[PDB]
A paper describes a structure:
Small Hsps (sHsps) form large oligomeric assemblies with a high capacity for holding onto nonnative proteins that are handed over to the ATP-driven chaperone machines for refolding. sHsps are ubiquitous among the kingdoms of life and within mammalian genomes occur in large families with members differentially expressed in many tissues including muscle, brain and the eye lens. Small Hsp sequences have in common an “α-crystallin domain” (ACD) of around 90 amino acids, with most having a short conserved C-terminal extension bearing an I-X-I motif and a longer variable N-terminal extension. The ACD is an immunoglobulin-like beta sandwich comprising strands β2–β9, and the assembly unit is a dimer.
Here we have solved the X-ray structure of the ACD dimer of human αB R120G close to physiological pH, as well as higher-resolution αB ACD wild-type controls. There are highly ordered methyl pentane diol (MPD) molecules bound near the β6 + 7 loops and in the side pockets, where they mimic the binding of an isoleucine in the I-X-I C-terminal motif. With an interface area of 982 Å2, the R120G has a greater interface than any of the wild-type αB structures, even when the register and β6 + 7 sheet length are considered. This in turn results in loss of two interface ion pairs between Arg120 and Asp109 and gain of two new interface ion pairs between His83 and Asp80. Movement of these arches toward each other to form two pairs of interchain salt bridges blocks the groove. The crystal structure of R120G ACD dimer also reveals a closed groove, but in the mutant closure is caused by a pair of salt bridges between His83 and Asp80 close to the dimer 2-fold axis. The R120G with its new set of ion pairs would favour the ACD dimer in the closed form and disturb the subunit-exchange-driven assembly dynamics.
Author numbering:
A (entry chain A): 67 to 151
B (entry chain B): 64 to 150
C-alpha cells in the first residue's frame, strides 16, 4: 500500500505473522525491496511455509539515502522517506 | 500464529489465516490421508510496484476421519478452514 503525501512517501505492509528476524529491507538505486519468510514445521502431522516479495520504485523527489524501515506492534512494516521540497 | 489444528469429538479442523487472498487464488487438495493447501497472490504495476504473496502447507488426516467427507470453507474475516466429521 503506497502512500504519497505532500510531506512524506511511505509503503505499508501487513506482516502480522512474520517476526523481525524473518524480514529483510533493502534499497538499490531508486527501488525498495522487501522479503519475508516464515516456517512452522509443526511436527509429523503438519507444516506451513509463508513467503512474500515486494518491490516499490521511489519517487524522484525522495533521496533514496533518506529511506528507513520500521515495524509496529500491530504487525505492520513501513518503508518511508521525506519528500524534498 | 497463522494456523491452528483442533480436534473435537465430532470433528477435526485446521484453521488458516489467508486474509490477503481471494477465493480464486486458493487451492485445497485431499491426497489420500494428507491435506495439501496452496495460495498465491500477485499484484503488478509496471514500472512502479510489485507484491507477491505465497503459502504452502500439508497436514496428516487422523485415522478416524474419512478423507472423502472432508470439506473446506472461507470466512468473511479472511480465514480458511478445512474440516471433516469423525467416524
Amino acid at each position: 500500500e503506497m502512500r504519497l503525501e505532500k510531506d512524506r512517501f511511505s509503503v505499508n505492509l501487513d506482516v502480522k505473522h512474520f517476526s523481525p528476524e524473518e524480514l529483510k529491507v533493502k534499497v538499490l538505486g531508486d527501488v525498495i525491496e522487501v522479503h519475508g519468510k516464515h516456517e512452522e514445521r509443526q511436527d509429523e502431522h503438519g507444516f506451513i511455509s509463508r513467503e512474500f516479495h515486494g518491490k516499490y520504485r521511489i519517487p524522484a523527489d525522495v533521496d533514496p539515502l533518506t529511506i528507513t524501515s520500521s515495524m509496529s506492534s500491530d504487525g505492520v512494516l513501513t518503508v518511508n522517506g521525506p519528500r524534498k521540497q
